[PDB]
Design a binder for these strands. Structure first.
Length: 721
DNA sequence: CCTACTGCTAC
DNA sequence: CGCGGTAGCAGTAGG
C-alpha cells in the first residue's frame, strides 16, 4: 500500500510491507538537508530508506493540548508515514511503516535542539517506543575541515570545538594550513556527499534505549514546569564537557547534558543582552557593521542585513537580522528611547507595535548622528574582537559612555532564563553617573518613555503602574488621549469595537466610537447614561484598559565577564557599568598616548629622512635596497610595522622601512616638507594635551558632547512626530 | 481556576 | 504582494 497525503516524502519502496521493521525513515531539518538525504538514496537504495523533511522547530508535545497536537500537520504527517499510534505500550517495531528513524540535522546548536524535540516527542507521545534498542538513529557530519598546504598534505575533519582546539594549540604551528567553517548538510559538493553515504555507518550514531535517568533528563529539558531547574542545570555545566566524537553509541542522558545543553547556553547568548552595551550579539554585529562601513549615507535594509551578516560571520537567516535592524531603527512611541539607526521609511508604527513595518526592500537606514557620540570611536581599539571562522568579527561588547541597556531596556526569552528591563531617562542616567563620579548618593530612577505623555507611579520597589489618559469632554462623552506605553492602538480599537457591537458572550456597552488620531492618540467615545454610571463604579481607566504594570523583578543580563546575572536594582546595573567604564577611560588614554608617541616617532624619523636627503647627507637614487637598509638602521632609524609600532633593535613582528621609502616623491618637495613639520607639531601638542587629562576628564568631555547631541536628537524626534 | 496570550531571535 | 507555523520565560488578562 502507498501513501498519498504527503508529496515531499520519498517513501521507501518496502515501507510498512513485510519489511517495514528493516526500513529507515530519515527526518531532515530543512530542504537543504532533505536534498542531501534524497541524493543519498541514489547511493543506498530506495527499498529500505525514505526521507521526510521536518518543517522547523518541532512542537513540544508535553505542555500541548490534544487539539494543538492534532492540529499540527507536521507531527501528524510523521505519525502517518511511520504508521504510528499511541495505544498501549510499544513492544516491537513490527507495527510500523518503518523500523528505524534517523535524524538529519545541520550539525549546529539548533540542530541539537531539533533532536531533543524529536526525542522528547517520541518519548512522550509513545509509551515504550524508545525502549526498543537501535530504533533512534543520528546522521552526523564534521564541524570544521582543515587543509595542510605547504608541508605534507592531508585533511583533518573535526567533529567538535575541543578536538579542533587541542589540535590548534598542539599541532597547527607545525604546518601551513587553513580552517574552513563547515556548511550545509545540503551544500557539500554533492560528489563528496556520495562518500558520506558510501560509508554512512561511520556517520551513523545510535541512541541507547531508555535507561535510568533518561526519562528524567528529558523532562528537565522540555517540561514547561521546570524553568527554575534549567537555570541550575546550566550553572552546573562545565566547559569542555562535550560528547565523545567517536562512540557510535549515545546515551540520552548525556546527549542532553553534552549536546542539548550547548544549544541552551547558545540560546541565552543570543536572546539575552550584555549589561555593558545592552546588546544581543545580533544587534552588536549590526552596529559593528555600520561602523565598518561608513553608514552616514543610507542604504536599504534588505541590503544592509546581508552585508552585516557577511562581515560578522553571522550563520543564521538574514531575515532574522533584517528584523533586528528594523528593531534598532524604530522611533514610534513605546519603542526606542534612542534609536541608533534612522527609520528612513515604513519602519512600523505604534498602532501595532511595529508589526505594520514594510518589508526590508522598501525601507532604508543609516547611523543616527548621535550614535557615534554614544559609542565613541576612540574606544574601538580597546575591545576584544571575537575570532570566528579563521577571521575577526564584532567585539564581546561595546562600552558606550552611558549604560545603553538602561536607556532602551531589553526583552528576551532564553532557556531557564528570561529578561525584562524597561527604558529609562538618559538625563537621569547621566545625573547618577555624575553622582558616582563625585562619591555622591544615587537618586532612584523610574521607567521613562521617549515622547510618552502618561503617568507612572511606584507601588512597591521593582513595581510600577502605568496610566493612559481618559477625560470626560461632554455629558456622556469620554476622550482617550494617552495609552499605557507598550499598549498598541489596535488593541484598544478592537476592544472598543467589541463594546460597540457587543458579543456572543458579552452585551454591548458602547453607543458610538470615533478615531481622530493625529500625531497623538484620540478616541472619542459615547456612552448611554446607563453605562456612564456603571463605568464610574468600575473606574474609567480600569474599564477602558488604560492601566498596565511594569515589573523590574526579572532584570537579567550577562555581566562584564559573560556570566548571566539577575540584578535586584536599577542602580546596581548602573554601578556595574560605571566601574568598568571608568576603568576603560584610563585605559583609552593610556592607549592613545602610546599610539601618539609612536606617531611622533614616525613623523620625526620621516623628517630626519627628508632633512638628511635635502642636506645631501643621504642618497637613495641607486644603492641597492639591501645597502640602503643598512644605512638606515646605522643612522638609528627604527622600523615600523603596519600597526605603527616602532622597532629599534636590528615581518609583521619586526616591521619595515616602508614608512620612509614608501613615501611619495612628492614628500621631498619643500611644501610637503613643511606640511610634515606641521603634522608633527600637531601630534606633539595632541600628546601634551592628552597627558594633562584624567580618565574622568575625558569621560566628562564625551558626556557634554553627547548632551549637546542629545538635545538636537530630541528636537529632530519631536519635529518628526 | 487553569488557560492562553505577549514579547523576541531563531529554525 | 503576502500569509503562516514552532521554541523558550515571566507575567498578565481571558474563558
Amino acid at each position: 500500500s502507498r501513501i498519498t497525503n504527503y508529496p515531499k516524502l520519498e517513501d521507501a519502496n518496502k515501507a510498512g510491507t513485510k519489511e517495514g521493521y528493516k526500513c529507515t525513515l530519515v527526518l531532515t531539518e530543512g530542504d537543504s538537508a532533505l536534498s542531501l538525504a534524497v541524493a543519498g538514496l541514489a547511493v543506498v537504495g530506495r527499498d529500505y530508506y525514505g526521507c521526510y523533511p521536518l518543517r522547523g522547530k518541532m512542537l513540544n508535545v508535553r505542555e500541548a493540548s490534544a487539539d494543538q497536537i492534532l492540529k499540527n500537520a507536521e507531527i501528524q504527517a510523521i505519525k502517518k508515514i511511520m504508521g504510528l499510534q499511541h495505544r498501549k505500550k510499544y513492544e516491537d517495531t513490527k507495527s510500523l511503516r518503518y523500523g528505524h528513524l534517523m535524524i538529519m540535522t545541520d550539525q549546529d546548536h539548533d540542530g541539537s535542539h531539533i533532536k531533543g524535540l524529536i526525542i522528547n516527542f517520541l518519548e512522550s507521545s509513545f509509551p515504550g517506543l524508545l525502549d526498543i534498542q537501535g530504533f533512534l538513529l543520528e546522521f552526523i557530519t564534521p564541524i570544521i575541515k582543515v587543509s595542510i598546504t605547504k608541508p605534507t598534505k592531508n585533511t583533518i575533519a573535526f567533529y567538535n570545538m575541543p578536538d579542533y582546539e587541542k589540535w590548534r594549540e598542539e599541532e597547527s604551528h607545525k604546518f601551513t594550513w587553513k580552517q574552513k567553517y563547515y556548511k550545509g548538510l545540503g551544500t557539500s559538493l554533492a560528489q563528496e556527499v556520495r562518500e558520506y553515504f558510501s560509508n554512512l555507518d561511520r556517520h551513523l550514531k545510535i541512541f541507547h534505549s531508555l535507561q535510568g535517568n533518561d526519562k528524567d533528563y528529558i523532562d528537565l529539558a522540555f517540561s514547561k514546569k521546570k524553568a527554575d531547574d534549567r537555570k541550575e542545570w546550566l550553572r552546573q555545566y562545565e566547559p569542555g564537557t562535550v560528547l565523545d566524537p567517536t562512540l557510535k553509541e549515545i546515551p540520552i542522558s548525556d546527549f542532553i547534558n553534552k549536546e542539548l545543553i550547548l544549544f541552551s547556553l547558545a540560546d541565552n547568548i543570543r536572546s539575552i543582552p550584555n549589561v555593558l552595551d545592552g546588546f544581543k550579539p545580533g544587534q552588536r554585529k549590526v552596529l559593528y557593521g555600520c561602523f565598518k562601513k561608513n553608514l552616514k549615507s543610507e542604504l536599504k535594509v534588505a541590503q544592509l542585513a546581508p552585508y552585516v551578516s557577511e562581515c560578522t560571520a553571522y550563520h543564521h537567516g538574514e531575515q532574522s537580522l533584517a528584523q533586528t535592524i528594523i528593531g534598532l531603527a524604530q522611533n514610534f512611541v513605546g519603542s526606542n528611547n534612542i534609536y541608533l539607526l534612522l527609520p528612513n521609511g515604513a519602519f512600523g508604527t505604534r498602532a501595532t507595535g511595529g508589526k505594520d513595518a514594510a518589508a526590508a526592500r522598501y525601507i532604508y537606514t543609516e547611523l543616527n548622528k548621535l550614535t557615534r557620540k554614544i559609542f565613541h570611536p576612540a574606544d574601538d581599539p580597546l575591545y576584544k574582537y571575537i575570532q570566528e571562522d579563521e577571521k575577526t568579527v564584532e567585539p564581546e561588547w561595546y562600552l558606550p559612555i552611558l549604560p545603553m541597556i538602561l536607556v532602551n531596556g531589553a526583552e528576551g526569552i532564553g532557556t531557564g532564563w528570561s529578561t525584562y528591563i524597561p527604558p529609562f531617562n538618559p538625563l537621569e542616567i547621566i545625573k547618577n553617573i555624575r553622582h558616582l563620579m563625585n562619591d555622591e548618593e544615587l537618586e532612584q530612577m523610574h521607567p521613562w518613555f521617549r515622547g510618552w505623555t502618561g503617568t507612572i507611579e511606584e507601588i512597591e520597589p521593582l513595581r510600577y503602574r502605568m496610566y493612559g489618559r481618559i477625560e470626560q469632554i461632554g455629558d456622556n462623552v469620554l476622550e482617550i488621549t494617552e495609552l499605557p506605553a507598550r499598549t498598541w492602538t489596535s488593541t484598544i480599537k478592537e476592544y472598543l469595537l467589541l463594546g460597540l457591537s457587543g458579543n456572543d458572550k458579552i452585551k454591548p456597552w458602547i453607543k458610538d466610537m470615533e478615531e481622530q488620531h493625529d500625531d497623538n492618540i484620540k478616541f472619542i467615545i459615547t456612552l448611554s447614561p446607563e453605562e456612564m454610571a456603571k463605568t464610574r463604579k468600575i473606574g474609567f481607566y480600569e474599564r477602558f484598559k488604560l492601566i498596565s504594570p511594569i515589573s523590574l523583578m526579572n532584570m537579567v543580563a550577562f555581566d562584564p565577564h559573560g556570566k548571566i546575572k539577575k540584578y535586584n536594582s536599577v542602580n546596581e546595573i548602573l554601578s556595574e557599568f560605571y566601574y568598568v567604564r571608568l576603568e576603560y577611560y584610563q585605559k583609552r588614554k593610556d592607549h592613545m598616548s602610546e599610539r601618539l608617541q609612536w606617531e611622533v616617532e614616525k613623523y620625526s624619523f620621516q623628517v630626519k629622512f627628508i632633512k638628511m636627503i635635502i642636506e645631501k647627507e643621504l642618497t637613495v637614487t641607486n644603492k641597492p635596497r639591501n645597502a640602503i637598509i643598512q644605512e638606515l638602521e646605522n643612522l638609528g632609524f627604527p622600523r615600523f610595522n603596519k600597526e605603527g609600532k616602532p622597532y629599534y633593535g636590528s615581518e609583521e613582528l619586526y616591521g619595515t622601512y616602508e614608512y620612509l621609502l614608501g613615501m611619495r616623491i612628492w614628500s621631498l618637495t619643500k611644501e610637503r616638507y613643511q606640511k610634515l613639520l606641521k603634522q608633527k607639531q600637531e601630534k606633539e601638542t595632541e600628546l601634551e594635551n592628552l597627558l594633562k587629562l584624567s580618565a574622568k576628564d575625558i569621560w566628562n568631555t564625551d558626556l557634554k558632547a553627547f548632551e549637546v547631541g542629545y538635545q538636537e536628537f530630541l528636537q529632530r524626534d519631536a519635529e518628526a512626530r
